[PDB]
Each structure stands twice: as C-alpha cells, then as structure tokens.
Design a protein around this ligand. Structure first.
Ligand SMILES: Cc1cc2nc3c(=O)[nH]c(=O)nc-3n(C[C@H](O)[C@H](O)[C@H](O)COP(=O)(O)O)c2cc1C
Length: 107
C-alpha cells in the first residue's frame, strides 16, 4: 500500500527505520523528524488506550493484527487509522522487522 513504515524491533524501542512517502504525506512529517522514533508519536488525546494496549500485545507476541485507532498529524489534526501490522521473519524464523500499513479508517 501507499502508507507504511518499517520498524526494527532489534533496536531500542522498535524505531521506524523507513517511512513511505505516502506515510509522510498522511502524517505531515519528514523523514528526519521521525526516523529513529517509535511510531507511538502518532497517538494523542483521543486515542483509545485499550486499543494501544492490544497493539502492544500483538507486537509482544509478534503476530499480525488489524485495529482502528485515532492518530494525529504533525499539525494536530485527527485521523482514523486502520492499522495493519505484519511481522517479517528471516529464513531461519527469526524476527527481522515489522511492517505497519496505515489504511483509511472510520467511526
Ligand atoms: C510497524 C509498526 C507500525 C506502527 N504504526 C503505528 C501507527 O501508525 N499509529 C500508532 O498509533 N501506532 C503505531 N504503531 C504502534 C506503536 O509503535 C506501539 O507499538 C504502541 O503504541 C504500543 O506500544 P506502547 O504501549 O509502548 O506505546 C506501530 C507499530 C509498529 C511495530
């Protein structure tokens, strides 16, 4: 899809190591602003904490998940993020990355 990030869970706090141009357009950030940061900076006042906890659980267990949650652009504008997370493993079965795809959400 057009909007995604790749994170490296083998580095402290699972930082974004790549952000697609679509993601940067969606969120209003630049590469320099967000590479090396955990994606949680997108959350804000109206983000449902139970949903965030369930994302944490999915990441802990390194499984695919799809959730919808409120995120914020750099200028503070809310959007509904239909987030799909996909673990990426090497040939030996070891986790290498997560891919997170931001789709158009609702509600
Ligand atoms: C590849 C990937 C992409 C993510 N994308 C988003 C995102 O777009 N929006 C968001 O609110 N959280 C996103 N997250 C989730 C946060 O990085 C974090 O896992 C979540 O806030 C739960 O962890 P925490 O309780 O430490 O914050 C993403 C996580 C991964 C691994």
């Amino acid at each position: 899809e057009k909007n995604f990030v790749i994170t490296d869970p083998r580095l402290p706090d699972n930082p974004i190591i790549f952000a697609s141009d679509g993601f940067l357009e969606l969120t209003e950030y630049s590469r320099e602003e967000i590479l090396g940061r955990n994606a949680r900076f997108l959350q804000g006042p109206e983000t449902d904490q139970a949903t965030v906890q369930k994302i944490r659980d999915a990441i802990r267990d390194q499984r695919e998940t799809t959730v919808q949650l409120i995120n914020y652009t750099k200028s503070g504008k809310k959007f509904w993020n239909l987030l799909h997370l996909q673990p990426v493993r090497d040939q030996k079965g070891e986790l290498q990355y997560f891919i997170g795809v931001q789709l158009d959400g609702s509600d």
